[PDB]
Amino acid sequence: MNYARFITAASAARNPSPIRTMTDILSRGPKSMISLAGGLPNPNMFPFKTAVITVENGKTIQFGEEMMKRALQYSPSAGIPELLSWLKQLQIKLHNPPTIHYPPSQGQMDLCVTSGSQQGLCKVFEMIINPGDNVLLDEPAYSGTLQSLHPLGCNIINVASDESGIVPDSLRDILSRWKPEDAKNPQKNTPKFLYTVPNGNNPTGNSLTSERKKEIYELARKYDFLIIEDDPYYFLQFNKFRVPTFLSMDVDGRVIRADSFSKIISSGLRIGFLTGPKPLIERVILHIQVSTLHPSTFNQLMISQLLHEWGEEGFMAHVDRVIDFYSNQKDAILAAADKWLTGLAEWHVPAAGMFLWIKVKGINDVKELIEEKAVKMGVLMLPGNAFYVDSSAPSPYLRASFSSASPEQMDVAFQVLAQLIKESL
Amino acid sequence: MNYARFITAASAARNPSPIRTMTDILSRGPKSMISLAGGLPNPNMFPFKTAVITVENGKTIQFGEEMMKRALQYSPSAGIPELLSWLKQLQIKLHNPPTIHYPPSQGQMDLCVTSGSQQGLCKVFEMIINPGDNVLLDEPAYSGTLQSLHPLGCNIINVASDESGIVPDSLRDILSRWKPEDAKNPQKNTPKFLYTVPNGNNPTGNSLTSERKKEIYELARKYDFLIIEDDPYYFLQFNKFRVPTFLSMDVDGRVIRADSFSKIISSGLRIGFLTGPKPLIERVILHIQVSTLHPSTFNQLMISQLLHEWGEEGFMAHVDRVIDFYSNQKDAILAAADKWLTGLAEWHVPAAGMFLWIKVKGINDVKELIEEKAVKMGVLMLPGNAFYVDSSAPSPYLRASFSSASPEQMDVAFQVLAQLIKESL
């Protein structure tokens, strides 16, 4: 409601730059118009002329001469129109956000293509956080979010989590050190936002429930903080009945949602998307505008034409197939764990994503066992340390990835590991 | 010298955040190593499978099934090794920078592929600028960098320019506000950098001379600021003997260079590069690791395959053909302005780039004439106002691109302009 409180002096001073009133009155003017006003270079000097791109499970993609020229040219900051229209329509279909037909000053839903979903996150973090500000998340927390929040100098307050994600009473009893009304008052510092990964958390594999999601939201107006919903494994959930998202229940316009194509379409293409209240998305767009300018027009055209040829039908069917492959690799890594981990380790089953989070028994830090002993045996896994704010504390946990290894490779891995644990007890 | 000086407290506090040695320890390991430590998704799930791309002037680009999988997957933060080494070799050939074999902790040239050159420029600014800092540039100046700088709270000090770029005596005169030794003394605030576009400035189309570059460099030493060399038209000089770069005289390690592929190879691809002292490039790479993360691996591969069949000869031969193309467009626009505009506008001939900068004669502000009179006659050009820190100040100036228009379009545009200029006197 008071969007000015979630926007820095730096971000607030952004004015609309580039690629301006040029491809604009000449996008609504007569064909006779002549413009010498734009800042675009001649695309005919570019060496690549056509593209053909083969697709498994939908039809091949062709960039003719005219196309290619457009694929190689600058495009709008927030994305190409056809992919913006497709995504927006996708959110409505998927999340039906209460917010789609609010007035803009009031948090009308807006969306922008970013260069990966982590670019719009970083841009959100940058737009919001002053030095000293308090922010809510749950540990263990993705190491990248930890390393992007660090220099912004916020105080990160840890919210207790378990097999089912943030624990509401922990949120509520953290929050009880303020009155719901100091949110109206800048000086002693109510939390600016809560950040979470609701589905298959990196590194835990844990997801929030729908009952917990509504409690967290309630807490969210109550002390009037924003919810950053960083949701890159939303299309990667093992239950094929997906829980509603913070976006689906966002009646107030306090939720910015990051989606990722990286696990389902392409990591290397750098195309992800940001959903939120219109004037905050504006602040990230003014920033994109002086920065990357926009996501590669080539890679958007590819994805948009893939997506339009699929229908949200072929899209959704594509995700069920990739889901299936990730349950089957989950099955395998779990069976490996039961097989070799023994009353030696405890874990929960992953609900989404690609990570197993295993807590090693009566070993109080796992750096030496992995940095030293496992590597020498040809098996690598990831010490839990870097998934905490104080990463110097000992972690008895390992993250093991199941996205790629064959069941044999898991089997050998968990064999070698189980015995290095016992030779350490 | 002392890199600490041009690094924000927030910038110094970034720590490496890579997609890590999960894919480095697993590159010097025995074939039979197994890692469950990696953060990568399974690329076999991505739907596109091969690519065939045509090149006027060259071998067609192919991404077989394997190369495509690497193209869709996450790659290094600073770019793909083949593109980095090819761009590294390129700077060496073109600029021989003093700095290539200096120790890292000194000036030692380093290089980062970025998502456009403007992304790396945005990050250099953010790296350097505390609110209230002094920075030198020459107005008129690209409005994109004006709009990047402004939310940063630097005080921007205008240095005089003319047909040949910054006037070094104006630069000498402004610096006398300080004595060198105050460089050592952070309050008291000596400029932290001078920024310019040395070839074919957006807007004016002027170009620094070699001998001015040399005097500008000594001023930078004396009062010890960085020089930021924004050089996107480096490759578009109409004088085929190329003026030597600031990088090429950078004995001290004080120059940061942006190069752009946007006008020779592709604007829509979002691939450009940033050259400079390793400790300072280090900071921009770390800020990319929480940001875009890396430039589209796919688009980097397309340029790098191309570039590698061309050799540095087929590259320079390509630049040469685009020069000849933008040069006959300069010609033709010069000819349209002689024809129509003599006696009521003044202009220098553009030394590089794609713009003509024209001073109209008996008119204080050119805003209404264009945005109202000329638009209604179906001709657009761009008023100078937005190329100054104070865009509210009246401007007699028009920027006119010659990248695209055909002579006949230039002739009508100049005819219509002429007539409207004298219906306004």
Swiss-Prot record, chains A, B:
Enzyme Commission no: 2.6.1.39, 2.6.1.4, 2.6.1.63, 2.6.1.7
Summary of the tissues where the protein is detected: Higher expression in the liver. Also found in heart, brain, kidney, pancreas, prostate, testis and ovary.
Gene Ontology BP, a term: glutamate metabolic process
Residue ranges of the region described as Disordered: 181-208
Pathway annotation from the record: Amino-acid degradation; L-lysine degradation via saccharopine pathway; glutaryl-CoA from L-lysine: step 4/6
Temperature dependence: Optimum temperature is 50 degrees Celsius.
Function of the molecule: Transaminase with broad substrate specificity. Has transaminase activity towards aminoadipate, kynurenine, methionine and glutamate. Shows activity also towards tryptophan, aspartate and hydroxykynurenine. Accepts a variety of oxo-acids as amino-group acceptors, with a preference for 2-oxoglutarate, 2-oxocaproic acid, phenylpyruvate and alpha-oxo-gamma-methiol butyric acid. Can also use glyoxylate as amino-group acceptor (in vitro).
Main subcellular localisation: mitochondrion
A GO cellular component entry from the record: mitochondrion
Subunit structure: Homodimer.
UniProt entry tagged with the keyword Oxidoreductase: no
Protein name, UniProt field: Kynurenine/alpha-aminoadipate aminotransferase, mitochondrial
Residues that hold substrate according to the record: 20, 74, 142, 202, 399
Top-level EC class: transferase
CDD domains referenced in this protein's UniProt entry, alphabetically: AAT_like (cd00609)
Source domain of life: Eukaryota
Keywords, sorted A to Z: Acetylation, Aminotransferase, Mitochondrion, Pyridoxal phosphate, Transferase, Transit peptide
Cofactor: pyridoxal 5'-phosphate
Regulation of its function: Kynurenine transaminase activity is competitively inhibited by aminoadipate, asparagine, glutamate, histidine, cysteine, lysine, 3-hydroxy-kynurenine and phenylalanine.
Reactions it catalyzes: glycine + 2-oxoglutarate = glyoxylate + L-glutamate; L-kynurenine + 2-oxoglutarate = kynurenate + L-glutamate + H2O; L-kynurenine + glyoxylate = kynurenate + glycine + H2O; 3-hydroxy-L-kynurenine + glyoxylate = xanthurenate + glycine + H2O
Residues the record lists as N6-(pyridoxal phosphate)lysine modifications: 263
Compartment(s): Mitochondrion
UniProt cross-references to InterPro entries, sorted A to Z: Aminotransferase_I/II_large, Class-I_PLP-dep_aminotransf, PyrdxlP-dep_Trfase, PyrdxlP-dep_Trfase_major
